[PDB]
From Swiss-Prot, chain A:
Effect of E137V: In LQT14; loss-of-function variant causing impaired negative regulation of high voltage-gated calcium channel activity; impaired regulation of cardiac muscle cell action potential; decreased calcium ion binding
Location of Phosphothreonine modifications: T43, T107
Description of post-translational modifications: Ubiquitination results in a strongly decreased activity.
Name this polypeptide is given: Calmodulin-1
Amino acid sequence: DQLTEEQIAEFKEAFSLFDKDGDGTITTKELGTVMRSLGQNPTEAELQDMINEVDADGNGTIDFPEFLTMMARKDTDSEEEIREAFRVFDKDGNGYISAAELRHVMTNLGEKLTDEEVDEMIREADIDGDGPVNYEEFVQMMTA
Amino acid sequence: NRQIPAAASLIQTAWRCYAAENPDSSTWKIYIRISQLREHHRATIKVIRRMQYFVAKKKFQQAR
Ligand SMILES: [Ca+2]
Ligand SMILES: [Ca+2]
C-alpha cells in the first residue's frame, strides 16, 4: 500500500477513546466500557477473545503499536476465506446462492443482521432481474 | 455441521466491517442506545467491528 499518512493522527485519537486513563494500554474493561456504552452486552469471554486477537505479545493488553498493526490490515487469502464461507451455503456449489437463502442465513443465524442491512446487501449486488446472487461478485466488491 | 454459524458469522462480520466505511449505511441503525451518532462513536465502532472480524476469522479457520 502506502506509508501511513495523517491517519497516524486518526488511529491515535481512536486508541485514545478506549484508553480512558492514558496508560498507553487498552484492557478488557476498557473495551467493555466502550461496548456497553454502545448498548452491547458482551461476555468477559468475548472481550478476552477480542483482546487476544490483537495482543501481539502477551501482556494481555493492547498497546498502540499493536493497535496500529490491527488497523492496518490480506491479498487473496482473506478473500478466499469469505469465498469459502459462502461455499458452505452453496448447496450444489455452483457458485450462486439464492436471494431467499442468502437473506435467511443473514437474518436468522450467526450475528443475525437486520432486515434492512440484508436489503443494503442484496441491493449492492444488482441481481440479474429475479436471479440468484453471485457471491464471488460480493467478495471482490467487498475486498477491493 | 458446526461450520455453519462460524461461516454465517464471517460473512456477517466481513460485511459489517465493509459497510461501516459508508457513513450513510443502514448498518449504523443498529445502535439504538445512542441518540445521535457522533464521529467519536463511529471511531470506536469501526474498531469493535474489526476486532469482531479477526475473532470470526480465527473461529472459521478452526471449523473450515
Ligand atoms: Ca488503559
Ligand atoms: Ca500487548
